Design a protein around this nucleic acid. Structure first.
Ligand SMILES: Nc1nc2c(ncn2[C@@H]2O[C@H](COP(=O)(O)OP(=O)(O)NP(=O)(O)O)[C@@H](O)[C@H]2O)c(=O)[nH]1
Lengths: 122, 267, 119, 44, 54
RNA sequence: UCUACCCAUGUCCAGGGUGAAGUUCAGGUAACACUGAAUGGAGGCCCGAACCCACGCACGUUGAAAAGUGCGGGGAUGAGGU
RNA sequence: AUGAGUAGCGAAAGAGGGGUGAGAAUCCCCUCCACCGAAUGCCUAAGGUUUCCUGAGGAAGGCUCGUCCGCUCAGGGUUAGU
RNA sequence: AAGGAACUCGGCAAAAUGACCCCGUAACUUCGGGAGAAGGGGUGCUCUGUUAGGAGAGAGCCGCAGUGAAUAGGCCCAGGCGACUGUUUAGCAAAAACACAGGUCUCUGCGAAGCCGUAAGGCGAAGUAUAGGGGCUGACGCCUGCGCAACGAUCUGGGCACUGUCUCAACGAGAGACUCGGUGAAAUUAUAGUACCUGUGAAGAUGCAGGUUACCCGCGACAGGACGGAAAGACCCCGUGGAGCUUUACUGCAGCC
RNA sequence: UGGCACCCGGCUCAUCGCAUCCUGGGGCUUAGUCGGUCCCAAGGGUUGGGCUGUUCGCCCAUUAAAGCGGUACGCGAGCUGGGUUCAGAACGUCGUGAGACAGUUCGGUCCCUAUCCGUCGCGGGCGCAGGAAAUUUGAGAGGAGCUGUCCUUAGUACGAGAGGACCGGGAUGGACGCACCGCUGGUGUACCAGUUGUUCUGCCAAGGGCAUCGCUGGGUAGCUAUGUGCGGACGG
RNA sequence: GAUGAUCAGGUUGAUAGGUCUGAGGUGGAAGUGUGGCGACACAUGGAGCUGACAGAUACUAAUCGAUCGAGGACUUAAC
């Protein structure tokens, strides 16, 4: 359950290592987000030189959460950290690599490229 | 980016406009290190049909040659300019005669009109964190205004009667509501004049380092006990030490404003 | 749910331990009705423990029975009486061993009193 | 908190006693007034 | 809050309408006892409809 | 006999730290002042109980109390408390 | 008189069995349990002036009850050359 | 649970560190400090083992957790103000206000100068210009204004730790509330058989006019009205009402010449 | 010894008007995509933050939209000095002395057991032409009423082209509401284990008391949301 | 469920407690053997313990009795 002022950690090789959310898109008074949603965030930790810079405002997709997703058949999934991938408005990976496991829910949200680049999908 | 513009700044403009009539002469304080970017067009639009003089305070921290060149550029532009050091009176003696020469026309007109000459009314205006109050305290020798090493000390305009000769008006610093050119904002943030808790210090440090590498490579070489000019910033940061990954940015900006380096200017 | 009897848990356990060993000695006591209804659940459990009889059961009841003289001449305490000549009395009777016998209220505070005794 | 009255027998007799009243003239006037009214107890 | 006005006798008497007691449960004398209470002992000898106790 | 100041006589302060002057050996010297080592126990010095205050919050405000209680806080060998 | 049989009954662990008695949750005895213990221990100041001990009592006072009391009646009790 | 200041004037409140040893410690400085700076590591039990003389080292054995419960410092940056320790409005203000060590001006030759008293008589002092009264400032280093080293329940701003402050509340314990037995007050009170809506009215209607609703009596809760109750009020005039205060308003008695 | 006009912000709860911000229905002026303007309509909805004294205020990011107003600031016997607003202090400006201005700043005490009318719940009487037990009709009243994307229609209407409707179908969200504990979690003080100090059952082993339930790891029933099911669809 | 009230029962009966089987929770009981110098490990044994949840079983309590509660008004039309 990600919300305002929640610090995630990027899982791609763009140069940003930690972001802080600003708003959750997709509703008049929406206040929570889960796996497979899109958020707007500000970069809080980045290398002095690189593609992205500190203080920049971007948007990302959540891929891991402490509380996972209740699947249809009654199975549950859960991770140990909250991670996001920075994207463009056309839903493509801004970086080149995806690190760590990636939830399968992304596949049903037409995030095909991220799923393809992921090493292991659970 | 940089947006700092509280409500007292907004009230200052209205107060200055409402008390414009009494003003005889205007002093516009401008930092010497950044003479062009430190000017405020917003307050200049309000200020017209009034003689004025450009003042360059904190002139000890800037290079003499560039300041003198800028003084020439202001002089042949069509405005009088001077270089002043507030903390120790360097050029403070040669401002009363300049004011007298400027206002002599109205002074003689009034004298021939049949009244005794009166005191000169001056208004001091400029951006925050410049010697707007230290200059007044030096001029009055009284230490009557409050001064500090951070922007935003005074909050209300005040009248100061220096003898029977001057009536000075002080004013809190004023910034334009929205910046346009990011380089000017970066320079202003480097020199101070901003609360420094609203901006990104890392970008300021990066700008300082790249400007130094471009202009004063030798001063960057000497630095503080290390001699290298690599491509990134992490080489110099971890000189003297988990250590602060990038909090050393503050250190980079800490010494420069205190002139640990030699005198320099950004122009 | 269990009644609270208007006391903290530690004091409630203390009262229960006191009363359940006062009853075994005397074989009939007089209390308040709402306090004797909450008591019938523990005495019968202790009686079942006594009917079991093995060593493990005896050490279980030793944590819920206070040290009092009970009979004087032959010097047998409450635990020995419980395991000796009470389990022998209720040998073929399975189920309740106690009887609750109501009577009137008392002068001081009008609480309804009752008498509880072994069957 | 300390209340204003902290009893003590010696000071009472030294200040409001019979001999203290009789020592000066105003004390004698006080004794005369109390005798005139008829109070059962006088001095202290 | 303090009362705005005193209350007349009629209002007080009407308020005390439901403030009364109840006639107790009356049963037979147990073992020639004295008119004992329902589901309780005889006053004479603690009898239960002749079943004396205590 | 409460509180302000003064006078003469008594009395109280669990424990633990830091280590001034002075002294001795001594690189240094021709010996210093300065190195270190040992000894030494100064201070309106430090942490903190009894004792004395009264900075924050909450309760109480026809109160247990006509200035209190609970949890934190300041001084605690001195221009001290009694 | 109304408010009204309303607010309150002033920090805290008691349970059972015997006894007296016209009347017992509250008085006496016994056994367990529980709290303080740098005192909620003992001894002796200022101060109080019969409150101390024994036998009787149930009007009034004990924020309830009372066969009990620092309450009401009768008696008794305080010994210094250190 | 998830998040971790998003609340708010403000991290107010609560949460978090805390004990014994062993390593390691910055800028600055009045060279004494800062400093327990900041940061790391180890604690249980058994044998070796009169352990050398009470170790230390070694080997081992358990739990999620070893100062296993109670009591023991939260830390780091930047600006004002005051040098410091102390003292103040008992009962609204503990501070930047008072005092303070140092500096400076002025009077005083001894029956001193000043004070208390009508006077006698005293303090100053049994002391004598390196000593006493009365003013002004207020450490010590740099000028005739500039330095914050050390201290602070001081005023402003920032960053870590950490959390029910909150997104958004949910359970649980105790003392009240509620029922029964005993005892049992107070502020207030012109008499009342005491609805609502649009009007009227000294101008803000349970009581007046027109209409609409409403069987009699209680118990547990909320606080819109009775311009609700108590400090006559939590404040604007006026007292040709007082007191206090200042004299180029007068007139008296003090002292001095 | 001039001239001539006027007579407090925040919290918790809401309710009403239309002079309509969005959604519905229309003329229009406007290829469509759109946009502008003017009528009819009050049913529902109408946001989170950073600097800030929220001002004669700046910015960030969303949403179909971030409407204007009345009700003794709507609302203190419901809550907050947080502005206003006192006795202690610094600087100031004016003044011939008793003082004048607040121009800036730091600190700084009010309470209330609900009598009546009102609202929200729960009972006791009697009435209703014979006494009772069930099941009911419905004069009346209250509740609900919101919207976005995506696929088809088919790039078909159009538009030389680029570019593009659309309300008939079909899916699926946001916010709000009503139920419930089968699942994921929370609490769960008479449930089960580990462990520190001290004291007790004559001692060893077994146990009891006290230390916030002594402290830690779990946790059944019940109560619960952050969990699960359903709703606002039309139609006359 | 604040108290009244409502609902399930009163000995042709499963309303409550107890007892016996279960379901969940915890996680390998006491005693006795074996191995080790000892702290400890293994076996007997998914062991022992179990508030509120289920199914059986009258073992203990729901005995007595008391109180209340109708005989259907009048007129006119269709018998
Ligand atoms: N070196 C140097 N410092 C100067 C000079 N003038 C002023 N300063 C520094 O600037 C600070 C004071 O600046 P100040 O005049 O108060 O700035 P301001 O514009 O008045 N700020 P505000 O208006 O908000 O009160 C001090 O740190 C002072 O040392 C100068 O000429 N040289």
């Amino acid at each position: 359950m990600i919300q305002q002022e929640t610090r995630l950690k990027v899982a791609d090789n763009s140069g940003a290592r930690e972001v802080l959310t600003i708003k959750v898109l997709g509703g008049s008074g929406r206040k929570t987000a889960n796996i497979g949603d899109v958020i707007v965030c500000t970069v809080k930790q980045a290398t002095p030189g690189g593609v992205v810079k500190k203080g920049e405002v971007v948007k990302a997709v959540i891929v891991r959460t402490k509380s996972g997703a209740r699947r249809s058949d009654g199975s549950y999934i859960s991770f140990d950290e909250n991670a996001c991938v920075i994207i463009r408005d056309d839903k493509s990976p801004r970086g080149t690599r995806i690190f760590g496991p990636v939830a399968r829910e992304l596949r049903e949200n037409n995030f095909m490229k991220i799923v393809s680049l992921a090493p292991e999908v659970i | 980016t940089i947006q700092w513009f509280p409500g007292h700044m907004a009230k200052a403009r209205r107060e200055v406009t409402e008390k414009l009539k009494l003003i005889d002469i205007v002093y516009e304080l401008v930092d010497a290190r950044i003479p062009m970017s430190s000017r405020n067009p917003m307050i200049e639009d309000i200020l017209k049909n009034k003689p004025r003089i450009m003042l360059l305070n904190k002139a000890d921290k800037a290079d003499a040659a560039v300041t003198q060149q800028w003084k020439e550029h202001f002089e042949n532009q069509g405005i009088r300019s001077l270089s002043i050091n507030s903390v120790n009176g360097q050029g403070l003696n040669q401002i009363v005669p300049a004011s007298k020469e400027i206002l002599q026309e109205k002074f003689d007109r009034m004298r021939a009109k049949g009244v005794k000459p009166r005191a000169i009314r001056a208004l001091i205006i400029g951006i925050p964190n410049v010697g707007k109050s230290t200059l007044i305290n030096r001029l009055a020798k009284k230490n009557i205004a409050k001064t500090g090493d951070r922007p935003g000390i005074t909050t209300s305009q005040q009248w100061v009667k220096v003898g029977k000769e001057l009536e000075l008006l002080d004013t809190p610093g004023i910034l334009w509501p929205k910046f346009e050119d990011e380089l000017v904002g970066l320079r202003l943030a480097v020199t101070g004049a901003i609360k420094d808790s609203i901006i990104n210090l890392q970008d300021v440090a990066v700008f300082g380092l790249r400007f130094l590498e471009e202009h004063y490579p030798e001063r960057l070489k000497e630095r503080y006990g290390l001699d290298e000019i690599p491509e990134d910033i992490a080489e110099l940061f971890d000189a003297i030490g988990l250590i602060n990954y990038d909090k050393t940015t503050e250190v980079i900006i800490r010494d420069i404003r205190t002139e640990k380096f030699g005198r320099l200017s950004f122009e | 749910s269990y009644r609270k009897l208007g006391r903290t848990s530690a004091q409630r356990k203390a009262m229960l331990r006191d009363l359940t060993t006062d009853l075994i000695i005397n074989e009939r006591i007089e209390t308040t009705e709402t306090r004797a209804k909450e008591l019938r659940s523990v005495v019968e459990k202790m009686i079942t423990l006594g009917k079991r009889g093995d060593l493990h059961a005896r050490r279980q009841a030793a944590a819920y029975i206070r040290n009092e003289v009970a009979n004087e001449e032959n010097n047998q305490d409450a635990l020995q009486k419980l395991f000796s000549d009470i389990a022998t009395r209720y040998e073929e009777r399975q189920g309740g061993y106690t009887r609750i016998m109501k009577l009137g209220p008392r002068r001081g505070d009008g609480a309804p009193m009752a008498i509880i005794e072994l069957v | 908190m300390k209340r204003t009255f902290q009893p003590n027998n010696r000071k009472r007799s030294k200040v409001h006693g019979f001999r203290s009243r009789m020592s000066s003239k105003n004390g004698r006037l006080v004794l005369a007034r109390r005798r005139r009214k008829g109070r059962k107890v006088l001095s202290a | 809050a303090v009362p705005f006005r005193r209350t007349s006798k009629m209002k007080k008497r009407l308020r005390r309408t439901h403030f009364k007691l109840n006639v107790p449960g009356m049963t037979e004398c147990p073992s020639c006892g004295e008119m004992k209470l329902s589901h309780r002992v005889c006053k004479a000898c603690g009898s239960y409809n002749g079943k004396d106790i205590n």
